[PDB]
Phi, psi and omega in degrees: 000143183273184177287334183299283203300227242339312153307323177257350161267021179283309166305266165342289208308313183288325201275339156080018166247161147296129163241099176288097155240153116254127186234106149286102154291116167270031190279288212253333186089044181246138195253122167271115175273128156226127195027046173313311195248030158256170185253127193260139137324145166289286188077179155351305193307335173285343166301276166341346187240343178270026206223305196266002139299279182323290169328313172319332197255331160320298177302349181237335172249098187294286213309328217298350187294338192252348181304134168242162186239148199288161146250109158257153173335319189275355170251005175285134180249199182310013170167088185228118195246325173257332183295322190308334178301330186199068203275146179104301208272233140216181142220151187276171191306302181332309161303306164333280167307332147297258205327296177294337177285304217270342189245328220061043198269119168309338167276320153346295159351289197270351160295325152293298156348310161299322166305335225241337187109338215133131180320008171246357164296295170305344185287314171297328169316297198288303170317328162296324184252014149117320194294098204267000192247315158325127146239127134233126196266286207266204105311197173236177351272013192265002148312318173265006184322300207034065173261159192316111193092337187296100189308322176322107161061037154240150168233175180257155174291322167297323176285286203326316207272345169286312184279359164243349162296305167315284200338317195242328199249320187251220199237013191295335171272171179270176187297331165288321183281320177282340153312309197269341189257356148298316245280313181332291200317317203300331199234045175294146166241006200248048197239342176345286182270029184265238200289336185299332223279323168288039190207152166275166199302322185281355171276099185302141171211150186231125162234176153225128125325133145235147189214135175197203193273178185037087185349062158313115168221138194212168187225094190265092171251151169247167214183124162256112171288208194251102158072046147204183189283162188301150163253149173255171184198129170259100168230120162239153198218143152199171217227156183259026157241124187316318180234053171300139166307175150308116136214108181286322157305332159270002166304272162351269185328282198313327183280324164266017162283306183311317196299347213290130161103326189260000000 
């Protein structure tokens, strides 16, 4: 073990949780793993790959980002902050996909989902673009239960930090797409105390959030530092009490172990 994983199960240890990181440096492409290959609840962090199936579907239906979808009363769930704006109305996949990235609105979610055919849809997204590890089985909000062993609507940090690293940094998307879907990340509003909260301030950043039951709390970013190549970062957490808090401060600590050296 190097010294960083001596830091981050140092880290695990005071947090009284499991902790899941990835860090790709894409200078050399060399990857720091801690319990890179168990498998985390996703939570929200799965909004991204259903957000970037929808861009997938773009490249051959240019229009479809503008295409609007109805909002009904029945379909708002547990946490729609933008969809509740326009329940009678619509929004377009473009909104949608704001709204589920940048706020986490859970109805957003479940509307790309739905584009996609079912939660077997993003699954087929992710396996067309090599992420051979992504399930996502349900919607939300029972997407997020993250109960303990439950294989359901989980990934490994190595596979994420792989697929987001294609997603944002390589080519799985076309060149329009993998554009609008940083633009998405840069202008997360729910990210304040995670991986930003660890890093330093001149370093640009794009994330998606997760948040769930047995105080799940996880964090996905690409990261321009100061003069050198971008990083992906992976960190997920969850806890062995059903209903733990959020902790978001240890997200911090694991990033501002990572940042140390880059």
């Amino acid at each position: 073990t190097s010294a960083v994983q001596q830091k981050l199960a140092a880290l695990e240890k005071s947090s009284g949780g499991r902790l899941g990181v990835a860090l790709i440096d894409t200078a050399d492409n060399t990857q720091v793993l801690y319990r890179g290959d168990e498998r985390f609840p996703m939570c929200g962090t799965s909004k991204v790959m259903a957000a970037a199936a929808v861009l997938k579907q773009s490249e051959t239906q240019k229009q479809l980002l503008n295409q609007p979808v109805e909002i009904k009363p029945a379909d708002l769930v547990n946490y729609n902050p933008i969809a509740e704006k326009h329940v009678n109305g619509t929004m377009t996949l473009a909104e949608l996909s704001a709204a589920a990235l940048q706020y986490s609105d859970n109805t957003a979610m479940n509307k790309l989902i739905a584009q996609l055919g079912g939660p077997g849809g993003v699954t087929a997204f992710a396996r067309a673009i090599g992420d051979e590890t992504f399930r996502l089985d349900r919607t939300e909000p029972t997407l997020n239960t993250a109960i303990p062993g439950d294989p359901r609507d989980t990934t490994t940090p190595r596979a994420m930090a792989q697929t987001l690293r294609q997603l944002t940094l390589g080519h799985a998307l076309g060149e329009t797409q993998r554009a609008q879907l940083v633009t998405w990340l840069k202008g997360n509003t729910t990210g304040a105390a995670s991986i930003r909260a660890g890093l330093p301030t001149s370093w640009t950043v794009g994330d998606k959030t997760g948040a769930g039951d047995y105080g799940t709390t996880n964090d996905i970013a690409v990261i321009w530092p100061q003069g050198r190549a971008p990083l992906v970062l992976v960190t997920y957490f969850t806890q062995p009490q059903q209903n733990a808090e959020s902790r978001r401060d240890v997200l911090a600590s694991a990033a501002r172990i990572i940042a140390e050296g880059l």
